[PDB]
Amino acid sequence: LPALIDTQATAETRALYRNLAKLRYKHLLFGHEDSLAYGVHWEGDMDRSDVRDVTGANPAVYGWELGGLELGHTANLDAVNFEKMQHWIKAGYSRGGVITISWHVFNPVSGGNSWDKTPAVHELIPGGARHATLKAYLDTFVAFNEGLADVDAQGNKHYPPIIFRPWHEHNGDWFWWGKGHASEQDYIALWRFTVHYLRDEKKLRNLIYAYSPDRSRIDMANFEAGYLYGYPGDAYVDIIGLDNYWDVGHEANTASADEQKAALTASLKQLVQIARSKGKIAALTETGNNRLTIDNFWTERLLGPISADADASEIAYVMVWRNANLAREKSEQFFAPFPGQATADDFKRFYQSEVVLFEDELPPLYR
Numbered sequence: 532l533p534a535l536i537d538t539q540a541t542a543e544t545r546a547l548y549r550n551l552a553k554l555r556y557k558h559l560l561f562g563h564e565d566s567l568a569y570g571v572h573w574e575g576d577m578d579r580s581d582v583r584d585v586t587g588a589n590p591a592v593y594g595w596e597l598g599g600l601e602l603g604h605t606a607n608l609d610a611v612n613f614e615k616m617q618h619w620i621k622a623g624y625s626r627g628g629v630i631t632i633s634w635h636v637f638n639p640v641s642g643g644n645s646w647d648k649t650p651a652v653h654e655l656i657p658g659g660a661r662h663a664t665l666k667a668y669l670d671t672f673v674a675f676n677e678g679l680a681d682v683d684a685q686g687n688k689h690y691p692p693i694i695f696r697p698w699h700e701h702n703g704d705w706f707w708w709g710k711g712h713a714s715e716q717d718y719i720a721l722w723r724f725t726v727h728y729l730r731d732e733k734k735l736r737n738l739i740y741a742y743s744p745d746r747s748r749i750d751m752a753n754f755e756a757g758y759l760y761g762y763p764g765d766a767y768v769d770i771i772g773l774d775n776y777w778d779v780g781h782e783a784n785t786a787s788a789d790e791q792k793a794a795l796t797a798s799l800k801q802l803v804q805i806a807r808s809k810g811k812i813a814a815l816t817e818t819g820n821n822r823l824t825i826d827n828f829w830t831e832r833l834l835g836p837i838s839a840d841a842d843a844s845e846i847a848y849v850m851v852w853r854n855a856n857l858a859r860e861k862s863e864q865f866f867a868p869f870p871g872q873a874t875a876d877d878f879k880r881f882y883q884s885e886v887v888l889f890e891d892e893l894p895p896l897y898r
């Protein structure tokens with residue numbers, strides 16, 4: 532019964548959304564960022580994943596990241612070559628996996644990265660002096676998306692559906708599009724333009740739009756109000772997402788493990804209730820425990836609290852962040868295990884659970 536904001540979405544895109552809406556009651560798709568590009572201990576192989584090395588299966592959802600595309604770079608901000616990324620997206624889609632894309636856009640005013648807080652949103656939105664820049668930036672994605680297309684024997688063009696998740700964690704103050712650096716109304720104008728430009732002016736038909744505040748900056752006593760800070764309206768959002776590293780053991784969170792588990796369940800319950808009221812689909816669009824230091828992280832801190840409540844359980848997917856390559860990134864950073872890592876057997880159990888789906892047990896999502 533949920534309907535996409537693109538009334539003309541491709542058959543495959545419509546089918547994905549419909550099939551997520553059906554499977555969410557009894558299942559949870561697992562996702563991983565940059566999962567085919569590299570792992571903690573390897574880079575270069577054209578068909579490998581840390582996740583598959585542990586479980587024998589690829590993630591169901593593949594996350595990818597565009598930062599740097601807008602600057603005409605050959606590779607993204609983490610040195611993922613864009614041509615290889617296009618081939619990895621096509622490969623995952625060909626196996627029936629789901630594609631999601633985020634975009635840590637560089638600061639156009641200073642040339643710094645997304646964490647450079649020099650104000651820019653007011654200049655980028657319609658009427659702003661740098662509005663031409665925003666168009667040029669979005670045009671680089673249009674071009675990237677064309678490199679994902681195939682043409683069938685009858686001459687018809689086909690694309691992978693993409694869950695496009697821009698301008699994330701906007702209730703935080705860490706990105707230049709965040710609270711304190713952009714007004715709420717300017718953020719909304721930025722989001723609305725992004726949709727109007729891609730969906731209406733450029734006529735992309737293979738996008739599903741995901742909204743993703745950060746949990747850590749929402750007051751649990753007033754969840755809906757906090758979640759809806761900067762919300763652009765139901766005509767602009769398909770997935771009611773959430774980035775929640777906080778309730779899964781973030782080092783700065785002084786709450787007890789039991790309080791954290793209760794808060795994870797409550798956050799996802801309320802997320803799902805918002806989605807239900809709006810006729811959308813909810814998802815835990817980012818989470819994880821950096822360096823997987825928590826014993827039985829997967830079953831005790833993620834799956835248990837999700838499965839505890841039948842509302843919380845109605846999220847469609849959960850994605851964890853990237854497994855940065857040690858040989859080149861000097862800071863150890865990873866969110867899925869690799870063989871021999873302490874949580875590997877517990878991640879096998881997470882995989883094995885009837886609820887959780889990896890690529891190998893997905894139904895046909897695109898028909």
Ligand SMILES: OC[C@@H]1[C@@H](O[C@@H]2O[C@H](CO)[C@@H](O)[C@H](O)[C@@H]2O)[C@H](O)[C@H](O)c2nccn21
Nearest residue numbers: 596608609635699700774776817852853864
């Ligand atoms: O802090 C973890 C994660 C963030 O991770 C960063 O992601 C960028 C882009 O891939 C990368 O260059 C950095 O090295 C680092 O991995 C990311 O911003 C993500 O959206 C998020 N949200 C909360 C925590 N993270």
Ligand code: NA
Nearest residue numbers: 555558844846
């Ligand atoms: Na679910």
Ligand code: NA
Nearest residue numbers: 882883884887
């Ligand atoms: Na399973």
